[PDB]
Design a binder for this molecule. Structure first.
Ligand SMILES: NC(=O)c1ccc[n+]([C@@H]2C[C@H](COP(=O)(O)OP(=O)(O)OC[C@H]3O[C@@H](n4cnc5c(N)ncnc54)[C@H](O)[C@@H]3O)[C@@H](O)[C@H]2O)c1
Ligand SMILES: [Zn+2]
Lengths: 4, 260
């Protein structure tokens, strides 16, 4: 999942 | 090359009517919120392990930042007018000040990439809470604790290394759909939000309103990039004038004052  | 004039005309003629906007802390310094560009280093403030160790630094920021503390400025209201004119496809924000939604832009138009103070979540049992629920504590310099499990209740701010919100993924459809990209008050340092600047089509104007040429706009300029460098409010003021929106912006801003 796209993560900061 | 394109000028600011050229971009304003594109908008005023609705040649660009699917505008995507990226913003950062620059747009909220006019509101009185300082940007970035014990606490062992700055980044600690959004690090989950540090937060578990010591959540008091974060909460001091949450208290400063909590909705109601600050009012949206003309930059926000410009973006609101963009929406009102039906030109705004989506506004992508790195800000956690929530001033976009306070300005009255509907949540469907917003992607709050770094989360929100409008809600909170217990760090232990995962019980969700309305942000109003922890407000007293945060303002009273208390660390809010969960009724159920005593765990720390943490605003739904996205921490370093955590999943970006669902709605961030909208970028896959939004950016290629955009017929104009507006980038306002971002250093474009924070991935993966930054590199979104590259995700519009080769043909699409990119207008940066910022103190400085930043990021891929600097290193990898494209034919139809426009840079309006200076104070962001001066930039927007200039854009609004070229658009001939000054009277519309007054009307809007006057209406909206009451709510605040
Ligand atoms: N308001 C907020 O929500 C807020 C406050 C401060 C920090 N942040 C963090 C900053 C970071 C995302 O980075 P980014 O949004 O790029 O912030 P940043 O602080 O890294 O960069 C902001 C950019 O805006 C520029 N800028 C600031 N004020 C003005 C002005 N008045 N006129 C023109 N340009 C101006 C500044 O020079 C810089 O290029 C995330 O960690 C955020 O949570 C958010
Ligand atoms: Zn709990």
């Amino acid at each position: 999942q796209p993560k900061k | 090359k394109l000028s600011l004039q050229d971009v304003a005309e594109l908008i005023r003629a609705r040649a660009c009517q699917r505008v995507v906007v990226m913003v950062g802390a620059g747009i909220s310094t006019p509101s009185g919120i300082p940007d970035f560009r014990d606490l062992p280093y700055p980044e600690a403030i959004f690090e989950l392990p540090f937060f578990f160790h010591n959540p008091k630094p974060f909460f001091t920021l949450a208290k400063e930042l909590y909705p109601g503390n600050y009012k949206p400025n003309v930059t926000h209201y410009f973006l609101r007018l963009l929406h009102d004119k039906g030109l705004l496809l989506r506004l992508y924000t790195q800000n956690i000040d929530g001033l976009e939604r306070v300005s009255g832009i509907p949540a469907s138009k917003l992607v709050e990439a770094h989360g929100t103070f409008a809600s909170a979540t217990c760090t232990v049992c995962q019980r969700p809470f309305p942000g109003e629920d922890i407000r007293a504590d945060v303002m009273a310099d208390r660390v809010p604790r969960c009724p159920v499990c005593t765990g720390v209740v943490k605003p739904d701010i996205v921490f370093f290394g955590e999943p970006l919100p669902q709605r961030f993924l909208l970028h896959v459809v939004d950016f290629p759909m955009a017929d104009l990209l507006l980038i306002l008050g971002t250093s474009l340092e924070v991935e993966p939000f930054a590199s979104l600047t590259e995700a519009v089509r080769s043909s699409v104007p990119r207008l940066l309103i910022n103190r400085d040429l930043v990021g891929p706009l600097a290193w990898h300029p494209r034919s139809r990039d426009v840079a309006q460098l200076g104070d962001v409010v001066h930039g927007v003021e200039s854009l609004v004038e070229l658009l001939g929106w000054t009277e519309e912006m007054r009307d809007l801003v006057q209406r909206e004052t009451g709510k605040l």
